[PDB]
Ligand binder design. Structure first.
Ligand SMILES: CN1CCc2cc(-c3cn4c(n3)CCC4)ccc21
Ligand SMILES: CN1CCc2cc(-c3cn4c(n3)CCC4)ccc21
Length: 305
């Protein structure tokens, strides 16, 4: 396919403040959302049907992430903690304490025995899921950490920060293996590995996404056309159909680029505030998007390709 044709299927209302993050469960059945309203909500991935609310954080939530078996969630909160949740029972299994300021980002490793987190306190922490203990504190950056992500076999962590750096860490040793420096260093507002783990996708607050070969330490692709100067917006690799890059934008649109040609192939209209988060379904051509305070809704979009 040369262009996808995503169309709005469902609009999911329920959060009473800005939505911060949406994530599809690895088994494809569910969507989790986090919000400034201190809640996690679970929704059906295919019908958008509200399932349940998970509560417990004392302040807003900035991020949520699924374990690989789709049975657990981890959330990152302004209350300086992460919480590990059993989704079926709703129970908080562990409260991960150690960060000294807002926790902004989180992720399980593929094995899901570890959680990585990034904080306003400028550190990256690695946690043991089963014990709830912090295993390593990495002196990762000199400004708030905007994103953290494990690669495909969990051996590496990538982190990004308003200090303008992306760094690659050895999970086991905690050593910094790579620092990515462009010809300039605008604040990096998001980063994640490509599915094959050979690239990293990095968002910067100069309306630019970049695809890096992080080993070579060189930029391969650049994506522009959207607006991103203020917020940390999630971006994605869409791989179920055509190979796209997907991102939210501060002009209330979802942007989709051809990964190879860097050309915009679709802009999804519907939201009425900044689209802060997008997620791509693991097996179907489905995108979830979520918006900030003036909108508060989550949208599910489906394409034939
Ligand atoms: C309520 N607000 C305002 C904008 C915003 C942004 C985020 C966020 C978290 N993460 C990202 N954006 C990218 C990687 C992790 C969370 C909460 C909020
Ligand atoms: C990744 N970075 C860059 C700037 C930033 C800002 C905040 C933040 C959240 N909240 C505040 N600041 C005040 C009330 C709630 C969290 C993470 C980050």
């Amino acid at each position: 396919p040369v262009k996808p044709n995503y169309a709005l299927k469902f609009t999911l209302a329920g959060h009473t403040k800005a939505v911060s993050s949406v994530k599809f469960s690895p088994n494809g059945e569910w969507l989790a959302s986090s919000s400034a309203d201190k809640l996690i909500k679970i929704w059906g991935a295919y019908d958008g049907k509200f399932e349940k609310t998970i509560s417990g954080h004392k302040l807003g939530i900035s991020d949520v992430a699924w374990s690989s078996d789709s049975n657990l969630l981890v959330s990152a909160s302004d209350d300086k903690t992460l919480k590990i949740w059993d989704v079926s029972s709703g129970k908080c299994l562990k409260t991960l304490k150690g960060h000294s300021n807002y926790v902004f980002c989180c992720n399980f490793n593929p094995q899901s025995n570890l959680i990585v987190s990034g904080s306003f306190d400028e550190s990256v922490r690695i946690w043991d899921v089963k014990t709830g203990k912090c295993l390593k504190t990495l002196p990762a950056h000199s400004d708030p950490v905007s994103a953290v992500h494990f690669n495909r076999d969990g051996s590496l962590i990538v982190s990004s920060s308003y200090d303008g750096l992306c760094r690659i860490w050895d999970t086991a040793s905690g050593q910094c293996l790579k620092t990515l420096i462009d010809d300039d260093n605008p604040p990096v507002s998001f980063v994640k590995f490509s599915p094959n783990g050979k690239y990293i996708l990095a968002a910067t607050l100069d309306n630019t996404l970049k695809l890096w070969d992080y080993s070579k330490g060189k930029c391969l692709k650049t994506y522009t056309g959207h607006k991103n100067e203020k917020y940390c917006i999630f971006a994605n690799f869409s791989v179920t159909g055509g190979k796209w890059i997907v991102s939210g934008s501060e002009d209330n649109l979802v942007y989709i680029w051809n990964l190879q040609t860097k050309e915009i192939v679709q802009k999804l209209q519907g939201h009425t505030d900044v689209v802060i988060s997008t997620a791509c379904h693991p097996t179907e051509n489905i995108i979830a998007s979520a918006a900030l305070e003036n909108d508060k809704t989550i949208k599910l979009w489906k394409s034939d390709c």
